[model samples]
Target chain A: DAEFRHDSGYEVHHQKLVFFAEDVGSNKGAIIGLMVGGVV
Target chain B: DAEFRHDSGYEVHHQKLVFFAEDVGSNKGAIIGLMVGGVV
Candidate 1:
Protein backbone atom coordinates (compact mmCIF):
# COMPACT_ATOMS: atom_id res chain seq x y z
CA ASP A 1 0.00 0.00 0.00
CA ALA A 2 1.04 3.59 -0.62
CA GLU A 3 0.27 6.85 1.14
CA PHE A 4 0.43 10.43 -0.06
CA ARG A 5 0.21 13.95 1.23
CA HIS A 6 -1.35 16.69 -0.90
CA ASP A 7 0.94 19.23 -2.54
CA SER A 8 1.49 22.48 -0.67
CA GLY A 9 -1.23 24.19 -2.65
CA TYR A 10 -3.62 21.26 -2.46
CA GLU A 11 -5.43 19.56 0.41
CA VAL A 12 -5.97 16.03 -0.72
CA HIS A 13 -5.11 12.80 1.06
CA HIS A 14 -4.49 9.45 -0.55
CA GLN A 15 -4.18 5.77 0.35
CA LYS A 16 -3.31 2.92 -1.94
CA LEU A 17 -2.03 -0.63 -2.17
CA VAL A 18 0.04 -2.37 -4.86
CA PHE A 19 0.95 -5.91 -5.81
CA PHE A 20 2.12 -8.02 -8.75
CA ALA A 21 0.78 -11.32 -10.05
CA GLU A 22 2.06 -13.88 -12.51
CA ASP A 23 0.93 -17.20 -13.88
CA VAL A 24 3.91 -19.57 -13.83
CA GLY A 25 5.79 -17.23 -16.16
CA SER A 26 6.30 -13.55 -15.39
CA ASN A 27 6.95 -12.37 -18.93
CA LYS A 28 3.45 -11.89 -20.28
CA GLY A 29 1.58 -9.83 -17.71
CA ALA A 30 0.85 -6.18 -17.04
CA ILE A 31 1.63 -4.00 -14.05
CA ILE A 32 -1.19 -2.38 -12.09
CA GLY A 33 -1.78 0.24 -9.43
CA LEU A 34 -4.85 1.58 -7.62
CA MET A 35 -5.18 5.00 -6.03
CA VAL A 36 -7.64 7.58 -4.76
CA GLY A 37 -7.29 11.22 -3.65
CA GLY A 38 -9.75 13.43 -1.82
CA VAL A 39 -10.05 16.25 0.66
CA VAL A 40 -10.88 15.72 4.31
CA ASP B 1 -12.21 -2.90 -19.65
CA ALA B 2 -15.52 -1.22 -19.03
CA GLU B 3 -17.22 1.45 -21.10
CA PHE B 4 -19.65 4.12 -20.06
CA ARG B 5 -22.14 6.47 -21.62
CA HIS B 6 -22.45 9.54 -19.41
CA ASP B 7 -25.75 10.09 -17.71
CA SER B 8 -28.35 11.64 -19.97
CA GLY B 9 -27.94 15.01 -18.29
CA TYR B 10 -24.14 14.88 -18.25
CA GLU B 11 -21.48 15.13 -20.92
CA VAL B 12 -18.67 13.11 -19.45
CA HIS B 13 -16.77 10.35 -21.24
CA HIS B 14 -15.25 7.38 -19.46
CA GLN B 15 -13.14 4.29 -20.03
CA LYS B 16 -12.14 1.64 -17.52
CA LEU B 17 -10.59 -1.76 -17.00
CA VAL B 18 -11.05 -4.36 -14.28
CA PHE B 19 -9.51 -7.68 -13.23
CA PHE B 20 -9.45 -10.09 -10.32
CA ALA B 21 -6.61 -11.99 -8.68
CA GLU B 22 -6.38 -14.92 -6.35
CA ASP B 23 -3.63 -16.58 -4.41
CA VAL B 24 -4.49 -20.24 -4.97
CA GLY B 25 -7.42 -19.89 -2.59
CA SER B 26 -9.09 -16.75 -3.98
CA ASN B 27 -9.08 -15.11 -0.59
CA LYS B 28 -7.00 -12.77 1.62
CA GLY B 29 -6.65 -10.10 -1.08
CA ALA B 30 -8.76 -7.32 -2.53
CA ILE B 31 -10.81 -6.48 -5.58
CA ILE B 32 -9.81 -3.52 -7.72
CA GLY B 33 -11.12 -1.36 -10.52
CA LEU B 34 -9.55 1.55 -12.42
CA MET B 35 -11.53 4.25 -14.13
CA VAL B 36 -11.37 7.73 -15.65
CA GLY B 37 -13.90 10.33 -16.70
CA GLY B 38 -13.40 13.47 -18.73
CA VAL B 39 -15.11 15.98 -20.94
CA VAL B 40 -14.11 17.04 -24.45
Candidate 2:
Protein backbone atom coordinates (compact mmCIF):
# COMPACT_ATOMS: atom_id res chain seq x y z
CA ASP A 1 0.00 0.00 0.00
CA ALA A 2 2.66 2.43 -1.03
CA GLU A 3 2.20 4.37 -4.16
CA PHE A 4 3.16 7.00 -1.59
CA ARG A 5 3.74 6.94 2.12
CA HIS A 6 3.82 9.36 5.07
CA ASP A 7 0.61 11.00 6.01
CA SER A 8 2.68 13.06 8.45
CA GLY A 9 3.67 10.69 11.21
CA TYR A 10 7.27 10.51 12.35
CA GLU A 11 8.79 11.10 15.73
CA VAL A 12 10.23 8.32 17.85
CA HIS A 13 13.17 6.29 16.56
CA HIS A 14 12.34 7.24 13.05
CA GLN A 15 13.18 5.44 9.83
CA LYS A 16 12.12 5.71 6.21
CA LEU A 17 13.31 4.33 2.89
CA VAL A 18 12.37 4.43 -0.77
CA PHE A 19 14.28 3.37 -3.84
CA PHE A 20 13.49 2.17 -7.31
CA ALA A 21 15.33 1.51 -10.55
CA GLU A 22 13.75 0.00 -13.57
CA ASP A 23 16.52 0.99 -15.95
CA VAL A 24 15.48 4.56 -15.20
CA GLY A 25 12.54 5.52 -17.29
CA SER A 26 9.04 6.83 -16.54
CA ASN A 27 6.93 5.82 -13.58
CA LYS A 28 9.15 2.80 -13.16
CA GLY A 29 10.38 4.93 -10.44
CA ALA A 30 11.84 5.95 -7.11
CA ILE A 31 11.12 7.85 -3.92
CA ILE A 32 12.89 8.54 -0.65
CA GLY A 33 12.12 9.66 2.89
CA LEU A 34 13.75 9.64 6.34
CA MET A 35 12.94 11.24 9.65
CA VAL A 36 13.58 11.12 13.41
CA GLY A 37 11.97 13.46 15.87
CA GLY A 38 11.73 14.36 19.52
CA VAL A 39 10.67 17.95 19.88
CA VAL A 40 8.48 18.96 22.73
CA ASP B 1 13.74 8.07 7.26
CA ALA B 2 10.44 7.97 8.99
CA GLU B 3 7.86 7.29 11.51
CA PHE B 4 7.92 5.77 14.90
CA ARG B 5 7.15 5.79 18.61
CA HIS B 6 9.72 5.20 21.29
CA ASP B 7 11.19 6.12 24.67
CA SER B 8 14.38 4.06 24.56
CA GLY B 9 15.88 3.74 21.13
CA TYR B 10 17.32 0.49 19.94
CA GLU B 11 18.21 -0.64 16.50
CA VAL B 12 19.76 -3.98 15.70
CA HIS B 13 17.76 -4.13 12.54
CA HIS B 14 18.58 -2.81 9.13
CA GLN B 15 17.24 -3.31 5.65
CA LYS B 16 17.45 -1.46 2.36
CA LEU B 17 16.12 -3.03 -0.77
CA VAL B 18 14.65 -1.64 -3.92
CA PHE B 19 14.22 -3.30 -7.25
CA PHE B 20 11.83 -2.20 -9.93
CA ALA B 21 11.54 -2.90 -13.63
CA GLU B 22 8.48 -1.68 -15.34
CA ASP B 23 10.05 -1.50 -18.77
CA VAL B 24 13.07 0.55 -17.72
CA GLY B 25 11.12 3.56 -16.54
CA SER B 26 11.70 5.49 -13.36
CA ASN B 27 11.76 8.69 -11.38
CA LYS B 28 14.52 7.49 -8.99
CA GLY B 29 14.61 6.85 -5.24
CA ALA B 30 16.92 6.13 -2.31
CA ILE B 31 17.39 6.76 1.40
CA ILE B 32 20.07 5.95 3.95
CA GLY B 33 20.39 6.71 7.63
CA LEU B 34 21.79 5.46 10.92
CA MET B 35 21.57 6.85 14.42
CA VAL B 36 21.97 5.71 17.99
CA GLY B 37 21.84 8.38 20.64
CA GLY B 38 22.24 8.10 24.38
CA VAL B 39 20.06 9.78 26.96
CA VAL B 40 19.95 8.85 30.55
Candidate 3:
Protein backbone atom coordinates (compact mmCIF):
# COMPACT_ATOMS: atom_id res chain seq x y z
CA ASP A 1 0.00 0.00 0.00
CA ALA A 2 1.18 3.52 -0.75
CA GLU A 3 2.46 5.10 2.47
CA PHE A 4 1.60 8.65 1.50
CA ARG A 5 -1.74 9.47 -0.07
CA HIS A 6 -3.45 12.78 -0.71
CA ASP A 7 -7.21 13.39 -0.49
CA SER A 8 -7.81 12.85 -4.18
CA GLY A 9 -5.72 9.66 -4.44
CA TYR A 10 -6.69 8.21 -1.08
CA GLU A 11 -9.94 6.33 -1.27
CA VAL A 12 -11.43 5.85 2.21
CA HIS A 13 -11.14 2.07 2.03
CA HIS A 14 -7.47 2.13 1.02
CA GLN A 15 -6.37 3.26 4.43
CA LYS A 16 -4.71 0.44 6.38
CA LEU A 17 -4.16 1.97 9.80
CA VAL A 18 -5.42 4.91 11.73
CA PHE A 19 -3.30 6.41 14.48
CA PHE A 20 -4.13 7.56 18.00
CA ALA A 21 -1.00 9.54 18.72
CA GLU A 22 -2.93 11.46 21.29
CA ASP A 23 -5.44 10.53 24.01
CA VAL A 24 -8.25 12.54 22.44
CA GLY A 25 -10.96 11.70 19.86
CA SER A 26 -11.45 8.17 21.15
CA ASN A 27 -8.69 5.58 21.56
CA LYS A 28 -11.48 3.06 21.48
CA GLY A 29 -10.26 1.32 18.35
CA ALA A 30 -6.54 1.60 17.52
CA ILE A 31 -4.51 -1.58 17.25
CA ILE A 32 -5.10 -3.40 13.98
CA GLY A 33 -3.78 -6.13 11.66
CA LEU A 34 -4.53 -5.97 7.94
CA MET A 35 -5.26 -8.98 5.79
CA VAL A 36 -2.89 -9.18 2.77
CA GLY A 37 -5.14 -7.47 0.22
CA GLY A 38 -8.02 -6.65 2.53
CA VAL A 39 -8.87 -3.14 3.63
CA VAL A 40 -9.79 -3.91 7.19
CA ASP B 1 21.79 -0.83 14.65
CA ALA B 2 21.43 -1.88 18.29
CA GLU B 3 17.71 -1.47 19.00
CA PHE B 4 17.79 0.78 22.09
CA ARG B 5 21.11 2.22 23.04
CA HIS B 6 21.52 5.03 25.60
CA ASP B 7 18.40 5.90 27.62
CA SER B 8 16.40 6.39 24.40
CA GLY B 9 14.95 3.83 21.98
CA TYR B 10 14.78 5.65 18.68
CA GLU B 11 17.62 6.16 16.19
CA VAL B 12 15.81 8.23 13.64
CA HIS B 13 17.21 8.83 10.17
CA HIS B 14 17.24 12.21 8.35
CA GLN B 15 18.93 15.38 9.58
CA LYS B 16 17.18 18.58 10.63
CA LEU B 17 16.82 22.15 9.24
CA VAL B 18 15.08 20.40 6.30
CA PHE B 19 12.24 18.47 7.92
CA PHE B 20 10.12 19.65 10.78
CA ALA B 21 7.87 18.46 13.70
CA GLU B 22 8.07 20.55 12.34
CA ASP B 23 9.39 16.88 13.41
CA VAL B 24 12.79 15.90 14.94
CA GLY B 25 15.31 14.58 17.57
CA SER B 26 19.14 14.23 18.19
CA ASN B 27 22.24 13.18 20.27
CA LYS B 28 26.08 12.62 20.39
CA GLY B 29 28.07 11.20 17.43
CA ALA B 30 29.79 13.76 15.29
CA ILE B 31 29.59 17.42 16.17
CA ILE B 32 28.43 17.98 12.57
CA GLY B 33 30.36 16.92 9.44
CA LEU B 34 29.26 13.31 10.26
CA MET B 35 32.25 11.09 9.52
CA VAL B 36 31.37 7.76 8.03
CA GLY B 37 34.11 6.09 10.07
CA GLY B 38 32.04 3.73 7.99
CA VAL B 39 28.28 3.44 8.06
CA VAL B 40 25.63 3.67 5.41
Candidate 4:
Protein backbone atom coordinates (compact mmCIF):
# COMPACT_ATOMS: atom_id res chain seq x y z
CA ASP A 1 0.00 0.00 0.00
CA ALA A 2 1.18 3.50 -0.76
CA GLU A 3 1.78 5.92 2.10
CA PHE A 4 -0.56 8.53 0.79
CA ARG A 5 -4.09 9.88 1.13
CA HIS A 6 -5.70 7.68 -1.47
CA ASP A 7 -3.87 4.69 -0.06
CA SER A 8 -6.84 3.93 2.14
CA GLY A 9 -10.45 3.56 1.23
CA TYR A 10 -11.37 6.83 2.87
CA GLU A 11 -9.21 9.66 1.60
CA VAL A 12 -8.38 12.67 3.77
CA HIS A 13 -8.21 16.25 2.56
CA HIS A 14 -6.76 19.49 3.93
CA GLN A 15 -7.13 23.16 3.07
CA LYS A 16 -5.36 26.34 4.24
CA LEU A 17 -7.00 29.72 4.02
CA VAL A 18 -5.41 33.13 4.53
CA PHE A 19 -7.46 36.09 5.58
CA PHE A 20 -6.57 39.41 3.99
CA ALA A 21 -9.96 40.54 5.13
CA GLU A 22 -10.90 41.18 8.75
CA ASP A 23 -13.25 38.27 9.22
CA VAL A 24 -12.03 34.89 8.05
CA GLY A 25 -14.78 32.44 8.63
CA SER A 26 -14.85 28.85 7.46
CA ASN A 27 -17.42 26.15 7.52
CA LYS A 28 -15.56 24.79 10.54
CA GLY A 29 -18.04 21.94 10.70
CA ALA A 30 -17.37 20.93 7.16
CA ILE A 31 -15.69 17.58 6.69
CA ILE A 32 -14.66 15.11 9.39
CA GLY A 33 -11.34 16.93 9.75
CA LEU A 34 -9.17 18.04 12.62
CA MET A 35 -11.18 21.25 12.82
CA VAL A 36 -10.11 24.42 11.04
CA GLY A 37 -6.46 25.25 10.46
CA GLY A 38 -5.91 28.57 12.23
CA VAL A 39 -8.52 30.56 14.09
CA VAL A 40 -8.07 34.18 13.02
CA ASP B 1 4.05 43.03 12.28
CA ALA B 2 2.82 39.50 12.77
CA GLU B 3 4.49 36.81 10.69
CA PHE B 4 1.26 35.67 9.16
CA ARG B 5 -0.30 35.45 5.78
CA HIS B 6 -2.14 38.77 6.15
CA ASP B 7 1.17 40.45 6.99
CA SER B 8 1.90 41.01 3.34
CA GLY B 9 -0.22 42.90 0.83
CA TYR B 10 -1.14 39.63 -0.86
CA GLU B 11 -1.93 36.31 0.67
CA VAL B 12 -1.23 32.67 -0.10
CA HIS B 13 -4.13 30.35 0.45
CA HIS B 14 -3.99 26.59 0.17
CA GLN B 15 -6.76 24.04 -0.09
CA LYS B 16 -6.42 20.28 -0.13
CA LEU B 17 -9.09 18.22 -1.80
CA VAL B 18 -9.41 14.46 -1.67
CA PHE B 19 -11.60 12.74 -4.14
CA PHE B 20 -13.45 9.60 -3.18
CA ALA B 21 -14.81 9.67 -6.65
CA GLU B 22 -12.98 8.28 -9.65
CA ASP B 23 -11.97 11.64 -11.01
CA VAL B 24 -11.07 14.76 -9.06
CA GLY B 25 -11.00 17.77 -11.30
CA SER B 26 -9.55 21.12 -10.25
CA ASN B 27 -8.70 24.39 -11.94
CA LYS B 28 -4.93 24.21 -11.58
CA GLY B 29 -4.64 27.43 -13.59
CA ALA B 30 -6.52 29.24 -10.87
CA ILE B 31 -4.66 31.38 -8.38
CA ILE B 32 -1.18 32.91 -8.88
CA GLY B 33 0.36 29.92 -7.14
CA LEU B 34 3.32 27.82 -8.17
CA MET B 35 1.08 25.37 -9.96
CA VAL B 36 -1.42 23.01 -8.38
CA GLY B 37 -0.55 20.45 -5.79
CA GLY B 38 -0.44 16.77 -6.67
CA VAL B 39 -1.44 16.02 -10.20
CA VAL B 40 -3.74 13.03 -10.35
| Greater-DockQ candidate between 1 and 4 | 4
Q: Which candidate would rank higher by TM-score, 1 or 2?
A: 2
Q: For model 1, how does the per-residue alpha-carbon lDDT over A1-40 read when each residue is reduced to its tens digit?
A: 3333222432223423344453433223333364444523
CA displacement after TM-score superposition, residue B30 of candidate 2 (Å):
32
lDDT (C-alpha) at residue B28 in model 3 = 24
Give all candidates' CA lDDT scores.
Answer: 0.37, 0.42, 0.31, 0.34
Question: Highest lDDT, which number?
Answer: 2
Off by over 4 Å in 1: A1-32, B1-25, B35-40
DockQ-based CAPRI category assigned to the predicted complex of candidate 3? incorrect
- In candidate 3, what are the lDDT values of residues B1-40, reduced to their tens digit? 3333233233333423322121123322223332233222
Top-scoring candidate (DockQ): 2
Candidate chain B TM-scores, in order:
0.19, 0.22, 0.16, 0.19
| For model 1 chain A, the run of ten residues with the poorest summed lDDT | A4-13
Clashing pairs in 4: none
Q: Please, what are the lDDT tens digits per residue for candidate 2 over residues B1-40? A: 4434333333423545555545464344543353323423
Query: Sorted on TM-score, highest at the top, how do the candidates line up?
Result: 2, 1, 4, 3
Fraction of native contacts under 8 Å reproduced by each candidate: 0.02, 0.26, 0.00, 0.05
**Per-candidate TM-score against the hidden true structure:** 0.17, 0.19, 0.11, 0.13
Q: Which residue runs of candidate 3 sit more than 4 Å off their true CA positions? A: A1-40, B1-8, B18-40
Worst 10 residues of 3 chain B by lDDT: B19-28
Name the regions of candidate 2 deviating beyond 4 angstroms: A1-12, A25-40, B1-18, B24-40
TM-score of chain A of 3: 0.14
Docking class of 4: incorrect
Per-residue lDDT of candidate 3, residues A1-40 (tens digit): 3334223322233223333333333323333332233223
The digit string of per-residue lDDT tens for model 1 on B1-40 reads 3343223432223423344453433423444464333423
